[PDB]
Structures are given as structure tokens and as C-alpha cells.
């Protein structure tokens, strides 16, 4: 009453059409828009040199008073977590532990130059290292001994050198693939990664890492299973060898879990003014090695040790570009998996801080990091999750924290490093699992998605299962394709609702859920909140016939039955509706006198040939019975998809469309009134 007064003529498709005229729509430089491109203006080249290389954006516009201290503390904490994590994922890749430090040094600084993100700790990610180890073991199995000229002892250095070479080759291929896709504007694919998809995939990866590193801390040595059901085989191999373990390895492993627990207690025990957000991992690892040395558990009970760490920067060496023909498949796998994880982490942290990250630029930077690392004896690299979260939470606000972490790792790899010699894998195990703590707390997504929407739970659980029992490349591909199939499903089980009319107004709402929307007499309105295409075409027609209670086949059957029982003694010059071929008797079953069916197309986004054909069949059938059909809510896309197909041959069909549900209702009533003459 207060507002919303319109009082306009009924806009049938023809009426509204003549009350409009088309604009020129003349585009500028049709076909070849590139003439306005290829300009040498300083601004465009400046933007190009910014976007292909974003280091020139930070150093000029770099605040010093507050960014520096946060960068220092974040860099210290990140490097602290980088060291044992790098060593652990190095030995998880069946390579000498030093290459973990190599991986923690070179790609980090190169990404700091080329990466587009402010909270990411580039480094040796667990799953990428696990794939590297899988291929390295597969091509160089432990029972293949290449006889040299020495024959001194059963030296493993030849095997490890071959493993390093094959790792270098596969990582070069991953870098080349990532660079090619990045320059091919392939970073748009980073959008088919839903939040539950990434959550479940990374959680499954956490389970994989947990089981493998669990094999490590027990002191038991078993075969490195890989492929489908890899985690099952690995964990049953560990359980089959729960016996003959190393008791002191568990002693120190639970002891360093104990120092983490006493670290949470240490936050309440020893802190007055000095302790910063201390990287408890450094004190944990130092205490572990010191306590192990003092208690004499290695020399008395033979705990496994990280091993000799050859000091010195190794010179660059061109890798053998001849293993590609038998490593390319899982090189593709590693590239895709690493890019997906790092871009998801970057996007997730880009919402907390307001800025944005360029996906394909991230692809280019990560690929160049991997390639040049391959040149410098470095296995494959992406964004780890625990380290990146630690760097963000500590307070770093520029990639200089990563640069400082790389500086610390360089200091470890060049000057010092003798102290980390006598270090047990149990400490590394605890470091990794504690880093897995939050990633495992991430199962809280299941009840929340169960309450919120079960399709998101379906994507989450499917991603979890496919990335747990199958591999992780195959799990990722299956999870993405299921994600797209779930979107498809959501258009094949829509909300078929029959619309009533709110009294005295033009608002139309579901009839059988509000008890105040008594439907207009003589009219049935059917609405689908989904596009009408091939995969949802016959479902729509069947639902229309079933739900409205108006079945043309049943009506014709009843009509011929009643007629049988009664007798006991222009170029398309076709009217779309047929009259009633009845003598107006009462033998037929008295149902309703519905005379028009108003299909709602306000929610129908698009149509195709099959949908056009099925509406043609619907209109033809209801016209044969004697029931008009009006398509309400005509849009540009719907009428375009109806005109392109030979639907609007216009016997009268252009007069059926209406621009609103109320427009169709009023048109039907006006036509009925004009028929009562």
C-alpha cells in the first residue's frame, strides 16, 4: 500500500518487444582487437614487468618500521621449522639428507624473487617428496647392485647417487611442465579446487605422511610400498613388524613428544619478559640430541641416526635429460599436485589479508624454482601447509621472512652442521607429527558440512577416500571430476514446486507450504529452479505431468474410454490449442477444469536442442488436449535458445511467452474473459 505502484499494460513477448528497439551494439575493432594492443607505452610495459616478476613491487613500497621486526621473528621461526622438516622429507624421499637443505635453500630464495604471495614458506613439501621417493625407489630398487671396481663392502653410495640423479631428472621435468602451463595461462584451473576438496585431499595426504613417518620412528625397516592401496600396504607392513623394534627409538620419540607437552606447560612455566613466540621445535631437537647423547642410548642400543651431512655448497650440474620417457607420467602428477596445493594455500591466505595472488604467475614462479633447483641438485618443491601457517601466524608480512629462513638454512649447510650429525629420526618423527596436529584437527569439517549441506560433505568424503585408498594424483583427478559431477547432480534433482498466488498481490510462492497462497482457480503454475537441457529434460516433463495432476496421456485415455462407453446404443495453418472434442457429458471422471499451464522460466538459465524439443512436445501435447501453455519469465538467453532452434516457427507461438508469472496469469484470465462471448 505504501509503495510499489506500477499499473502497466500486460507485457506479452510481442508487446514488450515493440515497446523496445535494439541499440547499434557495434563493437570496436571486431575480430582484431590486437591493433589497440601491442603498444609500447611505459605503463603497459611496467605492468608486464610487474606481473611476470613481482620482486619490483615490494622493495620500492616496503615499510620498515613495523614490517622488519615481524619479518625477523617469522623468518627465525620458519627456518627453525624448515631444518628438521627438510631433513625428514629428504629421508622420506630415499635421498641423502643434505638434499633437504638444498631444497630448503635454493627454491626459497628464487620464489622470493619470483613468487606472488606474502605468506608462503616454499620448501620440501611432504607429499611431493613422497612422490619423488616413490619414483626414485621404483626406478632404482634396493636389490639392483651395480658392480664397480671397488668391491670393498656393500656400499650404498652408488644406489643413492642413482636415486639423486633420477630425482633431479623428474624434478626438472616437473619444473618444465609447470613453467609451460604457467605461460600457457593454465592457472585458471586452480579454481576447480573447492574448499572441502582441498581440505579432504590435504587431510588424506596427512594420513599418508603419518603412516610413513610412523614406519620411521619405530626403528623398523620395511619395503616402501607404492601405488594403489599404498597406505594400507605400508601400515600392514609396519604392523607385521611391530615386533623386533628399537625400544630406545620409541623412548626418545615419546620423550620428544614429552618435551612438546612440557613445552605447552613451559608456556606457563618459564616466561617473564624475554621469550618471543619461541620456535619450540629448535629447543625440542637440541634437547633431543643432547639428552640422547648424555643418556647414551645410541652407543648402548644402536638407534638409527640421520647420517653424515657433507658440508659445502655443491656446484651446479646439468641433469640427465634422458629419463624423461619413463618419468613423465608422475612428473605430470607431481607438477599438478604441487601447484594445486600451493595455489590453494595462497588463495586461502589471500582472503585473510585482503590482497590477491595470481595463479598462473604462481605456476610460473614455482616451475622456475623447481627447474633451477634441479640444476642445483634439489628435489621437487611446493608450499608446505604447516610451515606456511606458522609463518603467517608468527607475523611476517613479506616474503623476506622466507629469504631469512633460506639464509639460516644456508648458514646451517655451510658453516655449522656438525652438531646435527648425531640426530635420531625419532625427533624428526615427532616434529612432523606435531606439524600434522592441526591438519588432523581439520576433520571438524565433517559434522559442520553434515549440518550445512550434504553435497559439500559428499565432495569432502569422496576426496578423502579417493586420495587415501587410491594414490594422490589419481585421488586428485577423481576428486575434481566428482566435484563437477556433484554440480551436474544439483541440476538433475531440482525443486519442482507448484506456485500459488499471494492474495491481492503479484507474489507467487509454493502452494503447499504456506497455507495463505491459495492458488488462482483454473490455472496450474509449475516452476523449476534449474536449466532445461539434455540431462534434465525428461525428468522435467515427467515431473510437470505428475506434480500438477494434469496428465495429457491420462486425459486422452479417459476421453476415449468415455466416448467408447457412451456409444452403448498460413504455411503452418495449425492452431496451437485444439478445442474440446466433447459433447459435454458427465460419464468422464470429474476432476479439475485446469485450462492453462504456466511454466516458470525465471529460474531457467539456459536451454539447448533437447530442451527446446521437450518444450515443443509439452506444448503440443497440452494443446492437443485443449490446455494452453504459457512460458512465464522470458529472458534474453531463454528466448535466444528458443529462436535459434526452430521453436518459434510462429503459428502463434511467439504469443505464448510472458515476462512475469503475474503477467501470464492476467493474460490467461483476460483471454478467458474474452472467450466468454
Ligand X SMILES: O=C(O)c1ccccc1O
Angle at 331 between CA 327 and CA 334, to 5 degrees: 145
Alpha-helix residue ranges (DSSP H) falling in 502-635: 538-547, 552-566, 609-625
- Point out which span in 157-165, 180-188, 200-208, 238-246 binds ligand X (CB under 6 A): 200-208
Q: d(Cα 64, Cα 595) in Å, to the nearest integer?
A: 76
Cβ proximity to a second copy: between 311 and 670 the closer is: 670
By the 10 Å C-beta count (0-12 exposed, 13-18 middle, 19+ buried), 617 is classed as: middle
Which residues lie below 8 Å from residue 244, measured CB to CB, with a gap of 6+? 220
Q: Say whether 422 counts as a known binding-site residue.
A: no
Which of a second copy, ligand X, none does residue 435 bind (CB under 5 to 8 Å by kind)? Answer: ligand X
* Residue 538 contacts residue 614 (beta carbons within 8 Å): yes
Which of ligand X, a second copy, none does residue 432 bind (CB under 5 to 8 Å by kind)? Answer: ligand X
Using the rule CB under 6 A, is 78 a contact of ligand X?
A: no
- Point out which span in 9-17, 38-46, 127-135, 159-167 binds a second copy (CB under 8 A): 9-17
- Give backbone dihedrals phi and psi of 659, rounded to 5 degrees, phi first: -95, -5
Q: How many residues bind ligand X (CB under 6 A)?
A: 13
Which residue among 234, 406, 435, 614 contacts ligand X (CB under 6 A)? 435
Which of a second copy, ligand X, none does residue 641 bind (CB under 5 to 8 Å by kind)? Answer: a second copy
Which residues lie below 8 Å from residue 262, measured CB to CB, with a gap of 6+? none
By the 10 Å C-beta count (0-12 exposed, 13-18 middle, 19+ buried), 250 is classed as: middle
Using the rule CB under 6 A, is 87 a contact of ligand X?
A: no
Q: How many residues bind a second copy (CB under 8 A)?
A: 84
Q: How far is the CB of 479 from ligand X (least distance, A)?
A: 15
Cβ proximity to ligand X: between 89 and 658 the closer is: 89
Which of a second copy, ligand X, none does residue 609 bind (CB under 5 to 8 Å by kind)? Answer: a second copy
Q: How far is the CB of 538 from a second copy (least distance, A)?
A: 7
- What are 157's three cell numbers? 653410495
Cβ proximity to a second copy: between 194 and 429 the closer is: 194
Alpha-helix residue ranges (DSSP H) falling in 92-156: 98-114, 126-139
Nearest to 630 by CA among 509, 517, 496, 526: 526
Q: How far is the CB of 209 from ligand X (least distance, A)?
A: 5
Q: d(Cα 592, Cα 573) in Å, to the nearest integer?
A: 30
3-state secondary structure of 598: strand
Which residue among 191, 313, 314, 575 contacts a second copy (CB under 8 A)? 191
| Interacting residues with a second copy between 443 and 502 (CB under 8 A) | 451-453, 455-456, 481, 483-485, 487-488, 490-491, 494-495, 497, 502
Which residue among 110, 122, 357, 385 contacts ligand X (CB under 6 A)? 385
Using the rule CB under 6 A, is 206 a contact of ligand X?
A: yes
Using the rule CB under 6 A, is 386 a contact of ligand X?
A: yes
The secondary element (H helix, E strand) that includes residue 641 is helix 636-644
Cβ proximity to ligand X: between 389 and 653 the closer is: 389
Find the distance separating the first CA and the last CA of the chain, reported in whole Å: 35
Using the rule CB under 8 A, is 603 a contact of a second copy?
A: yes
* Pairing mode, strands 122-123 and 628-632: unpaired
User: What is the number of helices (H) and of strands (E) in the chain?
Assistant: 25, 7
Using the rule CB under 8 A, is 659 a contact of a second copy?
A: yes
Q: How far is the CB of 231 from ligand X (least distance, A)?
A: 13
Length of the chain equals 677
Nearest to 444 by CA among 147, 631, 196: 196
* Residue 208 contacts residue 472 (beta carbons within 8 Å): yes
The secondary element (H helix, E strand) that includes residue 498 is strand 497-501
Using the rule CB under 8 A, is 510 a contact of a second copy?
A: yes
- What are 522's three cell numbers? 483454473
Strand order in the sheet with 596-600: 508-510, 497-501, 523-527, 596-600, 628-632
Which residue among 157, 512, 582, 592 contacts a second copy (CB under 8 A)? 512
| Interacting residues with a second copy between 607 and 626 (CB under 8 A) | 608-610, 613, 617
Using the rule CB under 6 A, is 384 a contact of ligand X?
A: yes
Please list the helix, strand and coil fractions of the chain in percent, rounded to the nearest 5, in that order.
Answer: 60, 5, 35
Q: How far is the CB of 43 from a second copy (least distance, A)?
A: 16
**Residues 109-148: x where in contact with ligand X by CB under 6 A, - otherwise, as a string:** -----------------xx---------------------
Q: How far is the CB of 103 from ligand X (least distance, A)?
A: 13
Which of a second copy, ligand X, none does residue 209 bind (CB under 5 to 8 Å by kind)? Answer: ligand X
Using the rule CB under 6 A, is 178 a contact of ligand X?
A: no
Q: How far is the CB of 647 from a second copy (least distance, A)?
A: 11
- Point out which span in 51-59, 384-392, 535-543, 623-631 binds ligand X (CB under 6 A): 384-392
- Residue number closest to ligand X, CB atom: 385
Binding-site residues from annotation for salicylate: 386
User: Applying CB under 6 A, which residues contact ligand X?
Assistant: 126-127, 202, 205-206, 209, 384-386, 432, 435-436, 439
Amino acid at each position: 500500500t505504501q509503495r510499489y505502484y506500477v499499473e502497466r499494460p500486460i507485457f506479452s513477448h510481442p508487446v514488450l518487444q515493440e515497446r523496445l528497439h535494439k541499440k547499434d551494439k557495434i563493437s570496436e575493432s571486431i575480430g582484431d582487437k590486437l591493433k589497440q594492443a601491442f603498444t609500447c607505452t611505459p605503463k603497459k610495459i611496467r605492468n608486464i614487468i610487474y606481473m611476470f616478476l613481482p620482486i619490483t613491487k615490494w622493495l620500492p613500497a616496503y615499510r620498515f618500521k613495523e614490517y622488519v621486526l615481524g619479518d625477523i621473528v617469522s623468518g627465525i621461526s620458519t627456518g627453525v621449522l624448515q631444518l628438521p622438516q627438510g631433513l625428514a622429507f629428504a629421508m622420506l624421499a630415499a635421498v641423502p639428507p643434505v638434499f633437504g637443505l638444498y631444497s630448503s635453500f635454493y627454491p626459497v630464495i628464487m620464489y622470493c624473487f619470483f613468487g606472488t604471495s606474502r605468506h608462503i614458506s616454499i620448501g620440501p613439501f611432504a607429499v611431493i617428496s613422497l612422490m619423488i621417493g616413490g619414483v626414485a625407489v621404483r626406478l632404482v630398487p634396493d636389490d639392483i647392485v651395480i658392480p664397480g671396481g671397488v668391491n670393498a663392502t656393500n656400499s650404498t653410495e652408488a644406489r643413492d647417487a642413482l636415486r639423486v640423479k633420477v630425482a633431479m631428472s623428474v624434478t626438472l621435468l616437473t619444473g618444465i611442465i609447470q613453467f609451460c602451463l604457467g605461460v600457457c595461462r593454465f592457472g585458471f584451473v586452480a579454481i576447480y579446487l573447492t574448499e572441502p576438496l582441498v581440505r579432504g585431499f590435504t587431510t588424506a595426504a596427512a594420513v599418508h605422511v603419518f603412516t610413513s613417518m610412523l614406519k620411521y620412528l619405530f626403528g623398523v625397516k620395511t619395503k616402501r610400498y607404492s601405488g594403489i592401496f599404498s597406505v594400507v600396504y605400508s601400515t600392514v607392513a609396519v604392523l607385521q613388524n611391530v615386533k623386533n623394534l628399537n625400544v630406545c627409538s620409541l623412548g626418545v620419540g615419546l620423550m620428544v613428544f614429552g618435551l612438546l607437552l612440557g613445552g605447552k606447560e613451559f608456556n606457563e612455566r618459564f616466561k617473564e619478559k624475554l621469550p618471543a613466540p619461541i620456535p619450540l621445535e629448535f629447543f625440542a631437537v637440541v634437547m633431543g640430541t643432547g639428552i640422547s647423547a648424555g643418556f647414551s642410548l645410541h652407543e648402548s642400543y644402536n638407534v638409527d641416526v640421520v647420517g653424515t651431512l657433507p658440508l659445502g655448497l655443491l656446484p651446479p650440474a646439468n641433469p640427465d635429460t634422458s629419463l624423461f620417457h619413463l618419468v613423465y607420467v608422475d612428473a605430470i602428477a607431481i607438477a599438478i599436485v604441487g601447484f594445486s596445493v600451493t595455489i590453494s594455500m595462497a588463495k586461502t591466505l589471500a582472503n585473510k589479508h585482503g590482497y590477491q595472488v595470481d595463479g598462473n604467475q604462481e605456476l610460473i614462479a614455482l616451475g622456475l624454482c623447481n627447474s633451477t633447483g634441479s640444476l642445483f641438485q634439489t628435489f621437487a618443491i611446493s608450499c608446505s601447509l604447516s610451515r606456511s601457517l606458522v609463518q603467517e601466524g608468527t607475523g611476517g608480512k613479506t616474503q623476506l621472512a622466507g629469504c631469512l629462513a633460506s639464509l639460516m638454512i644456508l648458514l646451517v649447510i655451510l658453516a655449522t652442521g656438525f652438531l646435527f650429525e648425531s640426530l635420531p629420526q625419532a625427533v624428526l618423527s615427532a616434529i612432523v607429527i606435531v606439524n600434522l596436529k592441526g591438519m588432523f584437527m581439520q576433520f571438524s569439517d565433517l559434522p559442520f558440512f553434515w549440518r550445512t549441506s550434504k553435497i559439500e560433505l559428499t565432495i569432502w568424503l569422496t576426496t578423502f577416500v579417493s586420495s587415501l585408498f587410491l594414490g594422490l594424483d589419481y585421488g586428485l583427478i577423481t576428486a575434481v571430476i566428482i566435484a563437477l559431477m556433484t554440480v551436474i547432480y544439483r541440476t538433475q534433482s531440482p525443486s519442482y514446486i507448484v506456485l500459488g498466488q499471494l492474495p491481492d498481490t503479484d507474489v507467487y510462492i509454493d502452494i503447499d507450504a504456506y497455507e495463505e497462497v491459495k492458488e488462482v482457480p483454473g490455472i496450474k503454475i509449475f516452476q523449476i529452479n534449474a536449466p532445461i537441457y539434455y540431462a534434465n529434460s525428461d525428468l522435467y516433463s515427467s515431473a510437470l505431468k505428475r506434480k500438477t495432476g494434469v496428465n495429457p496421456a491420462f486425459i486422452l485415455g479417459a476421453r476415449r474410454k468415455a466416448m467408447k462407453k457412451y456409444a452403448k446404443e498460413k504455411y503452418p495453418p495449425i492452431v496451437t490449442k485444439s478445442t474440446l472434442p466433447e459433447e459435454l457429458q458427465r460419464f468422464m471422471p470429474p476432476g479439475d477444469n485446469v485450462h492453462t499451464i504456466i511454466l516458470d522460466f525465471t529460474q531457467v538459465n539456459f536451454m539447448d536442442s533437447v530442451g527446446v524439443k521437450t518444450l515443443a512436445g509439452i506444448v503440443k501435447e497440452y494443446g492437443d488436449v485443449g490446455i494452453y501453455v504459457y512460458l512465464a519469465g522470458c529472458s534474453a538467453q531463454v528466448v535466444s535458445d528458443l529462436t535459434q532452434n526452430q521453436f518459434f516457427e510462429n503459428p502463434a507461438l511467439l504469443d505464448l511467452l510472458f515476462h512475469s508469472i503475474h503477467d501470464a496469469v492476467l493474460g490467461s484470465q483476460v483471454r478467458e474473459a474474452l472467450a466468454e462471448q
